[model samples]
Target: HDSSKDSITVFVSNLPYSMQEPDTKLRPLFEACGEVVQIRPIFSNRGDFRGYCYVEFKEEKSALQALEMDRKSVEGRPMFVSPCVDKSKN
Candidate 1:
């Protein structure tokens, strides 16, 4: 994505294995910060969930709040949130 997209997205990792697409129980945990536009589940080449995801918010400020969600507890897992970086070259 472009730099603007990254600015409004947060890389959330170390998510609970139980959490996946649709966010039945996950949306609330994040939307409490602001309006979430979409949630992208990262997958491995093996077609398995990677325990990480991309959460897009309506505003960059919302993503900023997500950053403070570092090590946030969710279903006995410590969720990590941070700015998404361009790692395509890696």
Candidate 2:
């Protein structure tokens, strides 16, 4: 996982567990904001869905644009979107 603070990644939460095929669900939507690089779906240790994911963009500009999608709903559940933070800083 690219944990670099400068990574053009967006941390997303509040995903519906019922949601499946995250890449299929999110790729198209984020492409509108910028070049979609990767989607890292977060999973629980017990193998359950974690209801959150990380989305990486090819450019920081795109990630910034995608942040506008915060509070948008998928499957009737609103999403919380924000830039990924450097855990090392915390």
For each candidate, the alpha-carbon lDDT, in order, equals: 0.73, 0.75
Q: What are the per-residue Cα lDDT tens digits for candidate 2 across 27-75?
A: 8789877998777776554878777777777787886777788888866
In lDDT terms, which candidate is top?
Answer: 2
**TM-score for all predictions?**
0.76, 0.77
C-alpha root-mean-square deviation, candidate 1: 5.0
At residue 62, candidate 2 shows an lDDT of 88
The true-versus-predicted C-alpha distance at residue 26 of model 1, in Å, is 2.1
Task: Give lDDT tens digits, candidate 1, residues 1-90.
Answer: 578888788776676665446354668878998789887665653866677667788898887777778887766767777777644673
Deviation (Å) of 59 in candidate 1: 0.7
C-alpha RMSD by candidate, in order: 5.0, 4.0
